[model samples]
Target: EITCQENLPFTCGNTDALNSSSFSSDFIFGVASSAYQIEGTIGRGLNIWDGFTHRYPNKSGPDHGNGDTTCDSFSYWQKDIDVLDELNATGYRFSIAWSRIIPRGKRSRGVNEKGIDYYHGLISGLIKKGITPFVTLFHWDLPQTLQDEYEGFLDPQIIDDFKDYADLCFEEFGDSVKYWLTINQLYSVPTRGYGSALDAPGRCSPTVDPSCYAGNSSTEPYIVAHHQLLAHAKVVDLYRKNYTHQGGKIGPTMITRWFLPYNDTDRHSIAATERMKEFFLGWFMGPLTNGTYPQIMIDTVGERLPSFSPEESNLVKGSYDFLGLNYYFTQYAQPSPNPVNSTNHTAMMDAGAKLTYINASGHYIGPLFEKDKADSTDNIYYYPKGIYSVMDYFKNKYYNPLIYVTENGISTPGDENRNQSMLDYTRIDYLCSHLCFLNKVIKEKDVNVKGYLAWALGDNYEFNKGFTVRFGLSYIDWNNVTDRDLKKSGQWYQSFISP
Candidate 1:
């Protein structure tokens, strides 16, 4: 059995010995967070998330939670840094709140000196503690002004506005931060937020969900995604043009899930898996690397999918200095007898595949990660092999750019009883198994993974799930924002990363 070292839960390790030393010394092991998710609305202007949670509280999730006062990381940032120091982390991934830094989402409107100063304090604090900052520029918290003025990413104006914001970050914090992520989960905002009325700035086709204030589930997803690509590429160009001397890298993070055929003998299921990839990862990867959308995407999405002009295509292709990847669960894809049709649609189903864990023979692809919460979508089965396969697939398909496993970790319902919440062996197992497979693939498949940052540093506002789930190494009392403690998982990770 695995046990804690020095009687500290943070020092827990397995008897089989899958630990941090399994990877190269230079590889990063750290924790991650987003501004709206953790920082709250203190000393900041309103973002769409603030509006979504307050205006449509019932729509966010069962808890109808809002980030108005999640962890109050704004006030307790030192505690976050303390956790990093305790974990011996070399990299710290977090985001700058655009609304905080630029209250109106435009540089001309007037910069928030207090907001800019806040980030300088946070960034410099990480540096003093020997943690490298991997900063994300946008993480789904667009200024409410932008959304009201021009529907946020739906309009082309966001490209120039985003560029102005990028210039400010590069000018102010570029010296201390070497790795800059242009956006978080590039596919998510457009697909979930716009096409399904599922996330912030909720807008979707009336047929999909009448709750959506306004949007076309089909066309808006493509428009938003198209603009995001251009916005990211434009920022990359601006950074390269003016900030190269700072020696910082700019990139985008792609959320990935390895899809497998539900039946080995079913050709349609096997083919559908590949087709799903073309629509999923390839949606962004193909354009950013090859200067064109996947042929399958062009054929299927047709006019509904926006087309990039020659100049725009050139700008987007090869835009990243590196690729940041966020991986969670894997799904088994089976071909649909009748493909998702025009009569009813949401952006996700556009991939034209059906997903499930159980195969035709009724065997699970892997054991569910959280036994007590088996019915929970968050408690999906753990499949370490998927990590290896995902890394290998990217290497062969996306030009083998420098890569970082930017976010990886599982979540448990916050409703779990007290002891179960702090113990968190299930989370530890999930981390260990994924890392072990990741290390194996680096050696055997020669994948270019440079770092691994856990999904979150502490429990905060989890998007639609709200406080329903916990994905933190440390526990935070929602009732008392300042109260914090490292769980056994954090203790184990601390020991795992120490020499």
Candidate 2:
């Protein structure tokens, strides 16, 4: 069993971004981003992600984090738009860096008007160019002030605080945005944050037992998730009351990584899969949907978690207008060994599941291509049906919540095979395979299936992967400032979503 490591076995294996097939018009083609990952500012403050990349440069590639000048997007807004327009992406889905907006996490802190102006310029410019804006409120960049004052997400005080923050957001630009994504991929925050210390703050809990924590319980992540849900519920309530009344839409985004049980019928395997689902993905959704946390986490931890007060439970219930899902890869889950770790494991293990490095074959997986080489499909294992099944399962479990795939597109670095023709063939196949499965549910079952979103249009810096994982439909020679090439994927996606 591999302890949390820097590399994931997955290789984004779609070489079809360079293909010839025409794309459909109904799809909402766009790119994805977070404030911490791309936008670089002089004093972005040492939030967890920045702290990780800069302080522990060895943990990440030497060239990781501190986007303070990356792609120089902070200084190169016009260039960003130029690249977006060149790709002809009709919609751009990105997040407003929380620290940049509030500067500090407190609501009493007068709003940063300069930060306000920068985003206003961005949102309006995208609109002027005929590109729709899908605004994500928070990705992972928590305000450092909040972290310092409260033990961070573990405290309930943040719900109201976050609500105050959201109120500002809605009041400011809620007037114009066609769509608002409350949070982007919250599942990843806790898992990557506390579970695998490799990413940020690099805190590896107890090694004696993988899931062991700092003390009696994994208090940090639990509170973090609670605040996140409460924040979502309150913002959702505010939006429903205010913005929806004004005819705007708002929803919390839960990034769905398709989790398949390795043994399929193995009892431990099934339990492990459920445990993973509960902690990683369902930690947020389960309560919002069922008014309680998933039984798996509850059963395993058995009251170790801080249950929501009735008021908090009611507040969290039904907090989304629609469920925005972002899926990229799938994992094979098997039951983690029992009595194998102490109760006080890291937050991830304390939540009661081990993130394995094993694949369906029970073989440990590694990066798809070479360490230094770019764009080779040497190690990718394709499974088109996995996505279709994921959607179906979500529909089954969540009673078909009005779902939108906020992001989905394979990643690959520069490779000879990723030519225009190959790009489209791979991308077309990827999109159509899932769409074929989805269109049926939409047409036949009348599921409120919104259009799909292609994860990214241009290659930007991937967090730990740096710029190594090329998930973009368009090619970004991060090396060259002025040259942006639309991969076969980007052109096809543009045509597909527009056609």
Candidate 3:
């Protein structure tokens, strides 16, 4: 079994010290991050996140923690380089805050030279330390101006504006960043953020969340997703025509989850699992690969789901050079009898699949990691083989696009003693087990997996859950953000990466 235990931290199957050498050379190994999650909001203009957390503080967590001053990476990014160097990492996957770069979310309005300089310095520091920078253009930090101006991704104007933003990035930092991710987790913005209003720009129908006063969870999610695809395609098109000389690859990342039947033998249960995947993975991957929404989505959502014209379809089809996947957990899906037109209906419910952690026989999908939250948001379970299943499915279904495991890691409950958090043998086991299965999938299944970047480099402001959980290799003193101390997992990872 690839899932390791705390008692056996370094061992993965029969291997003694599982490390990067176990995989093919030139396979990138790194950690993943985003600007809003790590970097503070000191010098940048207000984004939706800033507005959301401030307007509704309790929405984040008990303490209502936001990224206002999390890691303060903007001021102390050199320390980030030092940590990566310490871990002997080959790559670093991080995103630029659109608000930070263009404070008003428009190139015509103005540009923040300091924000540009900060990233240039960051890229230079990574190169200086022999680390590749896999840059993500948008990581959910939309400038407040755009949201207020045209309801953000709801309007078609987003395509031109996003293209303009991409043009600026290519012009400024194309030389250093070779691997570009157009957006991180395309599924998240529409479903979680806009549909349910759990994350930033918290805008759900009042029925879903009384706090949200201005969103139709059913229609807005589909609208937002339609715009996201068009916007992504325009950006990719822009890069190909103008920045191909820079020689970088661009793609979008999806939060991939493996779903199982709630009752394996029941036809309805089995169909529910398949239905869930079509709504979850196929929602974004379908257009990127086939230039149209999945037939299931079209049939289920009817006119609620948007259609692409020939021009838009041509622009979106085969738009990516690679596929970035973020896999964390899996769930058991059962059929839902709820009608789409019900007053309580939501985009999350549009899939017509009720997801649960346990199957009909009361067996969990996998071992429990944390069950703090009754819902999937905070509740997590470990199932390393899910990563293998996901890769294989994508390879078969998505035309075998170049793939990267961009974000995968386990997290402990957030409110723990610092020393206890650092002695993270559980995290060590999590990383090794996942790597072992990843290695197995590549060698055995020929899944075309190119690189593996863990979910985070250090603990930062996790969205919604806030400081309630820590998913970092090293512990950050929240009171003193600069004091980055390597956890036991970080130390073990360093040894695993070292020759």
Candidate 4:
């Protein structure tokens, strides 16, 4: 019988009974990172992240931190591989910086040979270490040139430019790289970047954030999301049609959250939770699976939601060989107003749900996931069972596609001293609890989950929050920038992977 340790409220703690033996023999165990999150802005063209952080220094972090010199992974990628090797990781999910590959935003402008060599070395190094590399083509780091020229994904012109960039990657790296992810998270750039202006290429309605130079939050998000799907489909088509001989698989990454009803017995709350599911997961899953937006989205969003033409729909439907899903936490969604006409309206509001870590009955969902130092009310919570629910739902609703848990892990505060940081019992609890549920769902539901890669390999530059939070299994000293010491969690993960 499977055993669990109940050190946390909503999750099982690190049980000695649990290890790699609990999972399928072929299932991959690994950690994940992204270019902008770890790689310093060196030997690469400027992207929107550089633009946003420089333009809005205060918004970058409490200390005005930026990725200008992040973990310096650009110079120290071999060190990153060392951490993965030490963990006995079978896979590593990382992203390619578009600006690094083609600095001018257009492949026709010129391909950066040095940037190409940078990734070539990393890929070759991972292969030499016997680690499978799952590379993402874009991770929200659009070249500044593209954003300035035509607002990036807001214009359909992005489809061709993205395709060209993807084509170069496939032609160059497709031989050794068996797995390719077209985009990091479909919903992030649209909702966070365009709706709230909380991320790069920051754009939203003036009333939402006066700092945004220009945008219609309510409308631009839909347009940008539409373009992202099209661009992704175009690249997938390019790969299959031209690079089929490479023996590789391509897909897109989605940031997922399982929504729960704020008041499970209240019909309005129940309805709101269902709507949130459609708005969050189904937003992209609909077109990828059914060749259309969810009916509720089309009905509520009205004319703002773009309609795919027959050819476009056909191209988008069945676009992926697998799905890279990133799950962090679940939220309790309650009914909210749809103020579509308000100057502050955003595409996100169309879901018409007020989300929180605490529910109507005054019950916090679970142990704290991330504390909000600025506002106690904004603190985040986690529900381990949500992983099982999310996996099962994807199996039943999204046609049982091959899946990879690309990003899932919690963060400890950056304020903790080295000793406190290295202990990391909380990180172990968060990881093991989620892994227990992940394993349970696969065994019970027979979901086609092939891998689980924790959110980060080591702490680097966290977007927006900057280094205020550390989400690494292996801890890094920001001051020294040369050490990747395994925390208690990393040591536990190492044993879990090897045992």
lDDT of every model, 2 decimals:
0.86, 0.63, 0.86, 0.92
Superposed on all Cα atoms, the candidates' RMSDs to the truth, in angstroms, are 3.7, 6.4, 2.1, 1.3
Q: After superposition, how far is residue 159 of candidate 4 from its true place, in Å?
A: 0.5
Better of 1 and 2 by TM-score: 1
Q: Write the per-residue lDDT of candidate 4 for residues 164-217, one digit (tens) a residue.
A: 999999988999999999998899999988999998888999999999989999
Pairwise lDDT winner, candidates 1 and 4: 4
Query: In candidate 3, which residue ranges exceed 4 Å CA deviation?
Result: 1-10, 13-17, 373-378
Off by over 4 Å in 4: 1-15
Better of 2 and 3 by lDDT: 3
Q: Which stretches of candidate 1 lie over 4 Å from their true place?
A: 1-16, 337-343, 369-379
> Candidate 3 lDDT (Cα, whole model)?
0.86
Q: Give the range where candidate 1 is weakest over 10 consecutive residues by summed lDDT.
A: 3-12
Better of 3 and 4 by TM-score: 4
**What residue pairs are clashing in model 1?**
10-491, 10-492, 11-491
Clashing pairs in 3: 414-468
TM-score, every prediction: 0.95, 0.82, 0.96, 0.98
lDDT of 2 by residue, 197-255 (tens): 55553443565234322312254556556677878888888888877645677888887
Candidate 1 per-residue lDDT, tens place, 202-242, comes to: 99988888888999888788899899999999999999888
